[PDB]
Design a protein around this nucleic acid. Structure first.
Ligand code: MG
Ligand code: MG
Ligand code: MG
Ligand code: MG
Ligand code: MG
Ligand code: MG
Ligand code: MG
Ligand code: MG
Ligand code: MG
Ligand code: ZN
Lengths: 113, 100, 211, 82, 114, 144
RNA sequence: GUCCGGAUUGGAGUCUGCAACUCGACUCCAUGAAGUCGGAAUCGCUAGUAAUCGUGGAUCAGAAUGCCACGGUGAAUACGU
């Protein structure tokens, strides 16, 4: 059986430190992976994050400013879209905060290509 | 460039000079006022029978040392490159770096 | 960074042109073409006469060519025979009555063209380059030169990565227009590749303008 | 426009072909490359296979096409959208 | 006032108020005026009908208003009917006279679309 | 100027009143080097201003700009390491230019069909501490 | 949205060139979009400068809003690091 330790206080241990394939009983395969803390995305370009949110294609090209950062730029379609509840507010805020997170982790001069 | 291009140029000029007189007379007949439109018609038909590479407007000034079809300078007959070598070496008479 | 051609910038101040004829724009280009091909023909034909410069001056009905060689007796051959031959040849190329009047260079070690082509001739004979350049500079300044800089660039000693090697001795003040700095460039084609040499030879400030 | 003092333009190989076609009756579509020639009144009702640069497209000349160049009926670019 | 054609000219210098009609511009307007003899700086108001009818008579000579609109529509429809290159670019809604279409062809393509 | 605090050059008096301030005014009002248009505008505005204010049109211009000249203004400083506003006094030569600049922009905003009129109307309201030119001066004083 | 703006389009032309359909420049008549000073952000410039007004040249049969040059008018500001 895979190692299983219970979490203590705020967060759990890192029991599985490996990535192992397993043959599914019916058909196919699964893979157990080690737990992760930060799935930050500084390697991804900022536009690739707008593409990643699937609920945003419904509003590309609907912003009067073409280079619409969509935060407070006038005419940001997804701004009003989330104003009326078409978009999940939490998703919009998460998009913004991961963008600003990329600014914090762009300090490294190492390359990721 | 490719020897093919220089050969093309020399052929174009050697045909333009040949058919110069005929082309000039024919264009005269064409554009000439008072010309009988049948004569003008025969002239405009005959004109396109001559080798198309006889029209001087069909040539291209190439560098007379490399054949480069760009950066040409009529005063010297060289591309924008070889003029600089000839100048800096003191081959173009009275040519020097300008400053004002 | 890059540096302006030293000979090309001192034409107004201390360096004379090498083709001093005059012609208006009507026949300027073909004059240049003719003199280019004639001087290239002469270079190809006098690859052993050790010519330094081929100055060309045209009278209205004639072409006059002055050769600067270190071996006058060579180019004139026997009883001025071959010089008359090549005079006929330049008459052919220019299509114009020609006259050839050779001129000698007394200090062949004080001619950037001469020493540069000698360096290249040594390189193509597969000799260690450092020896070549340092011998050249030593000879030059032994003949009383105010300064000399030699520079070689390319696959020196058949190097996989091309390097740049220079050697200066004396004074070589490129920025001073008043300076008599003779400069020329030569190339040597070896099995590894083409090696470029540049020679600056400063022979003293020329006080008192062009004349 | 070409001019009026020079009249319309046509290259005489096409002219000979078209006259030999009309004088001889109904003919197979004329296979020509001359996009530069202009449609004359006599070639009405003919069918010209004019080169688009990769193929000779058929064009059935009507009296409305008179006073126009042949190339105007052989598009040289294929496009559908994105 | 009233002039030939459905449109009513406003009260301003005749040469200018005459341009209101779809078929007449600045040069044709002053031509009409000179033919009718009325000066340019006159206004359409304070202008007796005795010359208004003359104005409408002289504007009747040229094609103007609706008849011109139908004539241009027939010409574009004919162009499209030939199947000529211009006809294609007309039914496609694109620059007809060889303009660059890689960029800034907006006047015929309308606003940017996603 | 990091190294050399260069001195300002001199302007030439105006050929109608020999007044350095008038010449500075027309230089500020000028557009695209069209000095003649500016001088036409300024002389027209000054003369109509004279008509409303009676005598001494050049003096009327002086007291007009006086009624709106600024004494104290906010200034930015990064010495703290963060943007820091500070109220500071203004040298006479600089507040002259500030008053002239505020007058001309206000006139352009006025509209009403002519620059000559806009300038005159703004000057006339400035002469009596009004026209919103004083209000802009008052707000930047309040920001002390 | 004008006696602003000139795009676009119809009609009719001129010229160069063997040849202006794709794909030239220009003229005339007609047509008269958007545009009413431009978000965050960002660029140039310290004086005959910026800004504005024209003129010329190279290339070139033809084809400059580009480039390289020429003059006309001609400012504002600089406490300070
Ligand atoms: Mg670090
Ligand atoms: Mg070759
Ligand atoms: Mg050409
Ligand atoms: Mg340089
Ligand atoms: Mg018009
Ligand atoms: Mg207008
Ligand atoms: Mg309008
Ligand atoms: Mg308005
Ligand atoms: Mg200028
Ligand atoms: Zn947006």
């Amino acid at each position: 059986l895979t190692n299983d330790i219970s979490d203590n206080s705020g967060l759990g241990q890192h029991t599985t430190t490996a990535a192992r394939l397993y043959h599914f009983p019916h058909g196919g395969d699964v893979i157990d992976s080690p737990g992760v803390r930060e799935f930050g995305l500084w390697h991804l370009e900022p536009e690739q994050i707008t593409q990643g949110f699937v609920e945003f294609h419904d509003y590309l090209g609907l912003c009067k400013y073409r280079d619409c950062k969509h935060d407070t730029d006038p005419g940001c379609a997804i701004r009003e879209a989330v104003e009326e509840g078409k978009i999940a507010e939490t998703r919009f805020e998460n998009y913004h905060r991961i963008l600003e997170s990329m600014a914090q982790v762009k300090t490294r001069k190492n390359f990721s290509d | 460039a490719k020897q093919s291009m220089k050969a093309r140029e020399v052929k174009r000029v050697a045909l333009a000079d040949k058919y110069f007189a005929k082309r000039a007379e024919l264009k005269a007949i064409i554009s000439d006022v008072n010309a009988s439109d049948e004569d003008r018609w025969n002239a405009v038909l005959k004109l396109q029978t001559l080798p198309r590479d006889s029209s001087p407007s069909r040539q291209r000034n190439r560098c007379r040392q490399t054949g480069r079809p760009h950066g040409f300078l009529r005063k010297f007959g060289l591309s924008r490159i070889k003029v600089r070598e000839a100048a800096m070496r003191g081959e173009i008479p009275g040519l020097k770096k300008a400053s004002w | 960074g890059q540096k302006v051609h030293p000979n090309g910038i001192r034409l107004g101040i201390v360096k004379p042109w090498n083709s001093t004829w005059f012609a208006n724009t009507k026949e300027f280009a073909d004059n240049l073409d003719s003199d280019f091909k004639v001087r290239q023909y002469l270079t190809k034909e006098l690859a052993k006469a050790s010519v330094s410069r081929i100055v060309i001056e045209r009278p209205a009905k004639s072409i006059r060519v002055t050769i600067h060689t270190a071996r006058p007796g060579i180019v004139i051959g026997k009883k001025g025979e071959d010089v008359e031959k090549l005079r006929k040849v330049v008459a052919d190329i220019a299509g114009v009555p020609a006259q050839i009047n050779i001129a000698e260079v007394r200090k062949p070690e004080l001619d950037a063209k001469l020493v540069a082509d000698s360096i290249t001739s040594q390189l193509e004979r597969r000799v260690m380059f450092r020896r070549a350049m340092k011998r050249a500079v030593q000879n030059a300044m032994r003949l009383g030169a105010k300064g000399i800089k030699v520079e070689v660039s390319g696959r020196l000693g058949g190097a996989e990565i091309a390097r740049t090697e220079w050697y200066r001795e004396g004074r070589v003040p490129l920025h001073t227009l008043r300076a008599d700095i003779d400069y020329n460039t030569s190339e040597a084609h070896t099995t590894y590749g083409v090696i470029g040499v540049k020679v600056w030879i400063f022979k003293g400030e020329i006080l008192g303008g062009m004349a | 426009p070409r001019s009026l003092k020079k009249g319309p333009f046509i290259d005489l190989h096409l002219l000979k072909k078209v006259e030999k076609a009309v004088e001889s009756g109904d003919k197979k579509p004329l296979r020509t490359w001359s996009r530069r020639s202009t449609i004359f009144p006599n070639m009405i009702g003919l069918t010209i296979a004019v080169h688009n640069g990769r193929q000779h497209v058929p064009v059935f000349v009507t009296d409305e096409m008179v006073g126009h160049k042949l190339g105007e009926f052989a598009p040289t670019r294929t496009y559908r959208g994105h | 006032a009233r002039i030939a054609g459905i449109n009513i000219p406003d009260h301003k210098h005749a040469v200018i108020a005459l341009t209101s009609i779809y078929g007449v511009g600045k040069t044709r307007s002053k031509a009409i005026l000179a033919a009718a003899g009325i000066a340019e700086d006159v206004k359409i108001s304070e202008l007796s009908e005795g010359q208004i009818d003359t104005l409408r008579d002289e504007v009747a000579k040229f094609v103007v208003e609706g008849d011109l609109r139908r004539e241009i529509s027939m010409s574009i429809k004919r162009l499209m009917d030939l199947g000529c290159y211009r006809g294609l670019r007309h039914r496609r809604g694109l620059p007809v006279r060889g303009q660059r279409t890689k960029t800034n062809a907006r006047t015929r393509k309308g606003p940017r679309k996603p | 100027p990091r190294r050399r605090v260069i001195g300002q050059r001199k302007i030439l008096p105006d050929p109608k009143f020999g007044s350095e301030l008038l010449a500075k005014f027309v230089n500020i009002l000028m557009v695209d080097g069209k000095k003649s248009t500016a001088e036409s505008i300024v002389y027209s505005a000054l003369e109509t201003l004279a008509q409303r204010s009676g005598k001494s049109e050049l003096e009327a211009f002086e007291v007009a700009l006086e009624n709106v000249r600024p004494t104290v203004e906010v200034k930015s400083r990064r010495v703290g390491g963060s943007t820091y506003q500070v109220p500071v006094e203004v040298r006479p030569v600089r507040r002259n230019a500030l008053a002239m600049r505020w007058i001309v922009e206000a006139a352009r905003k006025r509209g009403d069909k002519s620059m000559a009129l806009r300038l005159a109307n703004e000057l006339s309201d400035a002469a009596e501490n009004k026209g919103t030119a004083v209000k802009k001066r008052e707000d930047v004083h309040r920001m002390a």
